[PDB]
Amino acid sequence: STGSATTTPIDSLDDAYITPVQIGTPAQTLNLDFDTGSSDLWVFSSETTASEVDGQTIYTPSKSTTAKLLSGATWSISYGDGSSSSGDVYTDTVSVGGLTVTGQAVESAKKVSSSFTEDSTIDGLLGLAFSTLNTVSPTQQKTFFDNAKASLDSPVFTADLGYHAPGTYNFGFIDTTAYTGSITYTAVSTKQGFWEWTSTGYAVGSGTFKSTSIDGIADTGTTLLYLPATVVSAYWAQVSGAKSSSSVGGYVFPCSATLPSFTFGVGSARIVIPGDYIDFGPISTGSSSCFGGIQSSAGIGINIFGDVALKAAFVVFNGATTPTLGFASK
């Protein structure tokens, strides 16, 4: 089997991407944030505290003939940005882009943090990291990909995120028309439950490539590119007037700037992030100070190849017995 679904930015800045997902019978379609950095499929639901729902589409298990309460199971998760959610668990039929899993754990939110309430466009998350990170207790549950894997034509999914445009998540096949040149594959460590890999270095604009190992995660659920402070300083030093602002919470730059590209290494291959991808616009409405899309990972504790990086590439998440990551230009 295979699946193919379009993923769409939630706003003009590509702050996140949503992908329609069919849950239950009859289908209830919710727009979920596909997150390769976590492993819970959770949704706004009829059980969510009413004051914490503000425009989201909810899953109502009582209207689904295939929903079954997973007795005794609860979940609770916290994300890198400090947002959180928690609740109980149903199993139900879940389809993405024509690919169907029966008995998928669908984590129903009783509580969500303000950040989620305030984003009317995201109806939940669909985790695509390794199932070892799943938070369901007392019986840990498998991700959608883990459940689908054995049925897929090939045990892979691909992320093809757009810059200010829709893109695609494919399950079970590699669309050879969706990228240019070759896909370069690189080793993955699953020891922390993430798609963790080591980039071979970087360049700023037309500068010389610096060979250096940068360990980090491929995380579709993180907006920006978070890298070591040395790397980030070298990038922003090439932008006149750029500075790290403690009050704003990272590097800002004059909105009148033309940003240089940033290149990252995948083995001997190179992925080029155009400068425009690094512009996240005014820090507040009407400001001439703009927020940068490359930020320091110092104090996160891990480097994160988020959407800013991933949207510059066609990315293969290879879930073979020994998982790997593949990157191609496009």
UniProtKB/Swiss-Prot annotation:
Residues 17-328 form the Peptidase A1 domain. GO terms for molecular function: aspartic-type endopeptidase activity. The active site is at D35, S199. It catalyses: Hydrolysis of proteins with specificity similar to that of pepsin A, prefers hydrophobic residues at P1 and P1', but does not cleave 14-Ala-|-Leu-15 in the B chain of insulin or Z-Glu-Tyr. Clots milk. GO terms for biological process: proteolysis. Disulfide bonds join C255-C290. Keywords: Aspartyl protease, Disulfide bond, Hydrolase, Protease, Signal, Zymogen. The keyword Nucleotide-binding does not apply. The keyword Disulfide bond applies. Its EC number is 3.4.23.22. It is an enzyme of class 3 (hydrolase). Belongs to the peptidase A1 family. This is Endothiapepsin. It comes from Cryphonectria parasitica (Chestnut blight fungus).
